[PDB]
Design a binder for this molecule. Structure first.
Ligand SMILES: CC(C)(COP(=O)(O)OP(=O)(O)OC[C@H]1O[C@@H](n2cnc3c(N)ncnc32)[C@H](O)[C@@H]1OP(=O)(O)O)[C@@H](O)C(=O)NCCC(=O)NCCS
Ligand SMILES: Nc1ncnc2c1ncn2[C@@H]1O[C@H](COP(=O)(O)O)[C@@H](O)[C@H]1O
Length: 627
């Protein structure tokens, strides 16, 4: 039972994690789990030696499963289906690693990856892991400036990219965006590796850019390089301002142990089953559950290049699941809301044999009751909300379907996973009564596989995560826990919003808006949206002496966010106001504007400069349709 599992962890955490560590093939096995020598900066399995690519690929070939399918590429936007076995994947990754080594990549070097959803993206991640290089994958929906920030922070020796990708009605110009990002960056890579795609080919800068295939001619395959248990597996940037980059570090050994454990115990698949997360390699869901966890565990994983609707229609999810015999499906609530908007009766579902589909999982944003119940009703399988974040790399709260299918409380991601002692704390740092809203914190040490630190930013790591609640990790989410231990995730406690499942910094957006020549100051809030959960909304205050029309400035701002942050920011609603409501210390009362926009309750702020400002704000919101 799950109570037995969780109590077994509480009563003997070392024994629990050392046993889970037995599933990993070590070069040097760890002698213990927790390393508390640098508390409160805890680390796990630091004395191990291991290689991630060996456990995700080679080992399965050596076990006789070389002909098992490792990766299925299903790209409706290029009408392409490709299957790659574990033996084929071993050949591709070891030769690609050899090419990276021949051009100077060494253990510890960073390699940025800027690619759409193609199997070559996983091969690049795994090749870096094979060399002990440290990859950093950047979502292809980010703009050249955002890619430049990353280049500067991570100082990669190389960047791997594809020529293009396909979005509905638009080709994404990866290589031109990379070119502009490299020009913007102060740090310059030694070389780039460019995977050409026929939909829009790329220009190579001579001496810098090399063709993916040609660079592999005549190279020897590289071996799996042994790295320390606490060697970084990758750097994954999450929501932030250009001044305060948050490069989440993933430690190699805890990552292997924890992700492997989740595949049966949470996602209820056995080795050889087919698993599909409809996410992107640019996100942690794509790191953990497109690339690493299924391959570590010996599953088939699906790399899907398309959309829940429009590539070609709302049946695509069911066609993919049916055709490839998916057993567990992992997606985001926004994607299913799009499907049921187009196909409310689930007519596409009856067209396909879904008899292999056993469980659906949701994460990345609030899983609303309508979406849960529709999906349960139309698929007749359990639908499992579960909560986690870039920092943890795997579930904090879940329904542990491979251990015990617990009763689902619709609206809740269920219960704390082993390794997470989850508590709701008040302003004063004290646990509150069940059902009381507060900040969700996790008692240190955070579970194996979670971040030990931020890339070259230890001070920012301590401040943002370990300081508000000493002895705890501050998740950044607020919510409550009921009397049975079921979690409910409410809002972020910081500037972050979740748009269509995507974690975005509103502060990043304000910094961009604040650089428009005519804007004196601004505020970006996240308003409620039925389809996408939240949407960003901007308020603009012009400088003195601005005559220009208001909507024309608003357009240049919408366009500046798209150019500086990227299309993924989904920033379409900007408006112009005389002034912003502030407290005595000058803080902008963003929380009050949100409640006004959402038509939710609020109390007039107690230290607001001029209350009449909120009437002006209310008029600006009504012009945009809110509420
Ligand atoms: C919202 C949804 C219906 C897609 O529709 P959408 O119009 O693309 O909505 P988004 O907010 O994602 O897209 C915003 C913009 O970024 C672009 N975008 C999305 N993904 C992109 C990508 N991989 N590369 C480049 N641009 C991308 C879109 O084209 C869009 O551009 P537009 O303004 O010119 O139309 C939904 O399927 C979705 O995005 N789910 C989450 C995706 C995911 O990977 N989630 C992981 C969480 S578990
Ligand atoms: N199951 C969930 N329910 C509600 N919010 C979630 C859930 N999963 C993830 N999130 C939100 O998304 C954040 C993680 O984003 P990311 O780091 O990009 O994966 C969390 O901190 C939450 O704010």
């Amino acid at each position: 039972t799950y109570s037995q599992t969780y109590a077994a962890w509480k009563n003997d955490p070392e024994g629990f994690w050392m046993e889970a560590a037995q599933a990993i093939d070590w070069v040097t096995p760890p002698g213990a789990a927790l390393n508390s020598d640098n508390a409160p900066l805890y680390e796990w399995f630091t004395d191990a030696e291991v290689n991630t690519c060996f456990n995700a690929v080679d080992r399965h070939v050596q076990a006789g499963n070389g002909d098992r399918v490792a990766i299925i590429h299903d790209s409706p936007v290029t009408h392409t289906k490709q299957e790659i076995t574990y033996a084929e994947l071993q050949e591709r990754v070891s030769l690609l690693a050899g090419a990276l080594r021949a051009k100077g990549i060494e253990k510890g070097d960073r390699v940025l990856i800027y690619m759409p959803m193609v199997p070559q993206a996983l091969e690049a991640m795994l090749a870096c892991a094979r060399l002990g290089a440290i990859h950093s994958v950047v979502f292809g929906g980010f703009a050249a400036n955002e890619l430049a920030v990353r280049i500067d922070d991570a100082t990669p020796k190389a960047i791997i990219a594809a020529s293009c990708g396909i979005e509905p009605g638009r080709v994404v110009h990866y290589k031109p965006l990379l070119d502009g990002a490299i020009d913007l960056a102060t740090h310059k890579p030694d070389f780039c590796l460019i995977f050409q795609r026929e939909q829009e080919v790329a220009h190579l800068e001579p001496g810098r850019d090399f063709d993916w295939h040609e660079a592999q001619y005549g190279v020897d395959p590289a071996e799996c390089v042994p790295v320390a248990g606490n060697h970084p597996a990758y750097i994954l940037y999450t929501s932030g301002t250009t001044g305060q980059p948050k490069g989440v570090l993933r430690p190699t050994a805890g990552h292997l142990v924890a992700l492997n454990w989740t595949m049966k115990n949470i996602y209820n698949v056995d080795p050889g089953d087919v698993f599909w997360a409809a996410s992107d390699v640019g996100w942690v869901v794509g790191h953990s559950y497109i690339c690493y966890a299924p391959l570590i565990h010996g599953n088939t994983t699906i790399v899907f290049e398309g959309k829940p609707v429009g590539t070609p229609d709302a049946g695509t999810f069911w066609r993919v699941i049916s055709e490839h015999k998916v057993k567990s499906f992992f997606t985001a609530p926004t994607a299913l809301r799009a499907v049921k908007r187009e196909d409310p009766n689930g007519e596409f579902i009856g067209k396909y044999d879904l008899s292999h589909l056993k469980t659906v999982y949701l994460a990345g944003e609030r899983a609303d009751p309508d979406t849960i119940q529709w999906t349960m009703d139309k698929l007749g399988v359990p639908v499992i909300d579960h909560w986690w974040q870039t920092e943890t790399g795997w579930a904090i709260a879940a329904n542990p379907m491979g251990i015990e299918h617990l009763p689902v409380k619709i609206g809740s991601p269920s219960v704390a996973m082993p390794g997470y002692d989850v508590q709701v704390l008040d302003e004063g740092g004290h646990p509150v009564a069940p059902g009381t809203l507060g900040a969700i914190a996790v008692k240190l040490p955070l579970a194996p596989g979670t971040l030990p630190n931020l890339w070259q930013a230890e001070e920012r790591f301590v401040k943002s995560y370990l300081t508000t609640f000493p002895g705890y990790y501050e998740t950044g989410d607020a919510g409550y826990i009921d009397e049975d231990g079921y979690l409910y995730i409410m809002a972020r406690t910081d500037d972050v919003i979740n748009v269509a499942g995507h974690r975005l910094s509103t502060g990043a957006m304000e910094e961009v808006l604040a650089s428009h020549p005519d804007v004196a100051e601004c505020a970006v809030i996240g308003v409620s949206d039925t389809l996408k959960g939240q949407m960003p909304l901007g308020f603009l205050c012009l400088s003195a002496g601005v005559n220009r029309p208001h909507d024309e400035i608003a357009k240049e701002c919408v366009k500046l966010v798209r150019e500086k942050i990227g299309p993924v920011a989904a920033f379409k609603l900007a408006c112009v106001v005389d002034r912003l409501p502030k407290t005595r210390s000058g803080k902008i009362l963003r929380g009050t504007m949100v409640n006004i926009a959402d038509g939710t309750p609020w109390k007039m702020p107690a230290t607001i400069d001029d209350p009449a400002i909120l009437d002006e704000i209310t008029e600006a919101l009504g012009k945009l349709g809110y509420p």
